[PDB]
């Protein structure tokens, strides 16, 4: 099939601190036994975790980028090492986030470091997004036990979390002049932006990736159409997500005015939303 010529209008941004943050990431990996064999070290090298982070958080300072790369490296290792066996592994990880395996121990320590001195509303948002991400491993294994075709709408509802965007973007708040107020983080336009941006990225990933849990496959198997025809339909969905991102950004500006926020908070919210938009270009280029 012919891969669509995906176009995104937002500038392509990459973090200038990649080389230094990558050395700090690898040092943490080494310290934690997250790549305890050369096989594992080679898989880690080949995943491009560091480059991935430099595209997720292009505007971050070195300290924020470095913490973000630790999360990406950890999640790579969790993914590498992954229905009852999945539930058991996932529940042990989830437990660590509540103070309840070198990978699980690393997660609990990394969470302690991340939460320290960070506001409770942010911590709760990050945990919910991270737990939603982890739970997708169990959801998809459950669905695999069923005979019926997958529903696209339910797939997208889980895919916005399995792509990881939501918790990744939570970490972008660490580089802002202040954390988002709770009334901005979970306002209508921000939720719309977060979902559409996450789905744009994920659906582009699905096209480059095409395991049943893929929008291309789901459409093809439901309709009995050709692979190219299913791809073209996913391209239409992607364009829809783009236009939803564009709309939500405008709507966010209006909502910031309705809240009568301090200038610092308005600025932080606009910068966060520009980063969400940047990621549509960065992650397209990464794929």
Options 97, 201, 269, 280; binder of ligand 28U; rule CB under 6 A: 201
Query: Where do runs of H (alpha helix) occur along the chain?
Result: 18-32, 38-47, 49-56, 62-81, 84-96, 102-115, 120-144, 152-162, 165-172, 182-185, 188-209, 215-223, 227-259, 263-286
What is the distance, to the nearest Å, from the Cα of residue 25 to the centroid of all Cα atoms in its chain?
A: 18
Taking the least distance from each CB to ligand 28U, the nearer of 184 and 286 is 286
Options 15, 22, 32, 52; binder of ligand 28U; rule CB under 6 A: 52
Determine if 72 is a binding residue for ligand 28U (CB under 6 A).
yes
Check whether 209 is labelled as a binding-site residue: yes
Check whether 205 is labelled as a binding-site residue: yes
Give which of 183, 197, 71, 195 is closest to 121, Cα–Cα. 183
Region of residue 187 (phi > 0: left; psi between -120 and 50: alpha; otherwise: beta)? beta
Taking the least distance from each CB to ligand 28U, the nearer of 66 and 283 is 283
Q: Would you give the binding string for ligand 28U spanning residues 217-256, x where CB under 6 A is met?
A: ----------------------------------------
Determine if 8 is a binding residue for ligand 28U (CB under 6 A).
no
Taking CA atoms, 63 is separated from 17, 53, 60, in Å, by: 10, 12, 8
Options 103, 205, 217, 241; binder of ligand 28U; rule CB under 6 A: 205
* Shortest distance, position 286 Cβ to ligand 28U, whole Å: 6
Taking the least distance from each CB to ligand 28U, the nearer of 203 and 265 is 203
Determine if 93 is a binding residue for ligand 28U (CB under 6 A).
no
Q: Judging by beta carbons within 10 Å of its beta carbon (0-12, 13-18, 19+), is residue 224 exposed, middle or buried?
A: exposed
Taking the least distance from each CB to ligand 28U, the nearer of 163 and 196 is 163
Determine if 283 is a binding residue for ligand 28U (CB under 6 A).
yes
What is the distance, to the nearest Å, from the Cα of residue 159 to the centroid of all Cα atoms in its chain?
A: 10
Determine if 79 is a binding residue for ligand 28U (CB under 6 A).
yes
Check whether 79 is labelled as a binding-site residue: yes
**Coil, helix or strand at residue 145:** coil
Per the CB < 8 A criterion, the answer to whether 273 and 6 are in contact is no
Give which of 213, 202, 207, 201 is closest to 230, Cα–Cα. 207
| 126-185 binders of ligand 28U (CB under 6 A) | 163-164
Options 64, 66, 75, 281; binder of ligand 28U; rule CB under 6 A: 75
**What φ, ψ does residue 145 adopt, rounded to 5°?**
-70, -20
Determine if 275 is a binding residue for ligand 28U (CB under 6 A).
no
Determine if 214 is a binding residue for ligand 28U (CB under 6 A).
no
* Shortest distance, position 244 Cβ to ligand 28U, whole Å: 18
Total number of residues binding ligand 28U (CB under 6 A)? Answer: 9
Per the CB < 8 A criterion, the answer to whether 252 and 28 are in contact is no
- The binding site for substrate comprises 159
- The binding site comprises 79, 159, 205, 209
Binding site for ligand 28U (CB under 6 A): 52, 72, 75, 79, 163-164, 201, 205, 283
């Amino acid at each position: 099939f012919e891969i669509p010529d995906f176009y995104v209008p937002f500038p392509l941004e990459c973090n200038p601190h990649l080389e230094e943050a990558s050395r700090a990431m690898w040092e943490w990996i080494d310290a934690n036994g997250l790549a305890p064999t050369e096989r594992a070290r080679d898989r880690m090298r080949r995943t491009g975790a560091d480059l991935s982070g430099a595209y997720v958080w292009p505007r971050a300072d070195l300290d924020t980028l470095t913490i973000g790369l630790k999360w990406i490296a950890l999640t790579f290792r969790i993914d590498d090492q992954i229905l009852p066996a999945r539930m058991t592994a996932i529940d042990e990880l989830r437990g660590t986030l509540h103070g309840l395996s070198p990978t699980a121990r690393a997660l609990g320590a990394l969470w302690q470091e991340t939460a320290l001195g960070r506001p409770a509303t942010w911590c709760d948002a990050f945990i919910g997004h991270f737990e939603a991400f982890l739970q997708t491993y169990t959801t998809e294994a459950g669905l695999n036990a069923h005979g019926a075709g997958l529903r696209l709408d339910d797939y997208l509802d889980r895919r916005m979390y399995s792509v990881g965007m939501p918790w990744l973007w939570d970490l972008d708040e660490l580089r802002l002049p202040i954390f988002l107020p709770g009334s901005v983080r979970t306002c209508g336009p921000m939720n719309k932006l977060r979902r559409a941006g996450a789905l744009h990225i994920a659906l582009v990933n699905d096209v480059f990736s095409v395991y049943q849990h893929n929008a291309v496959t789901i459409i093809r198997e439901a309709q009995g159409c050709s692979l190219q025809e299913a791809v073209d339909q996913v391209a239409v969905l992607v364009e829809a997500q783009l236009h939803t991102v564009l709309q939500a950004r405008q709507e966010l500006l209006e909502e910031l005015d309705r809240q009568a926020l301090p200038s610092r908070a308005r600025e932080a919210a606009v910068d966060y939303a520009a980063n969400v938009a940047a990621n549509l270009s960065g992650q397209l280029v990464w794929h």
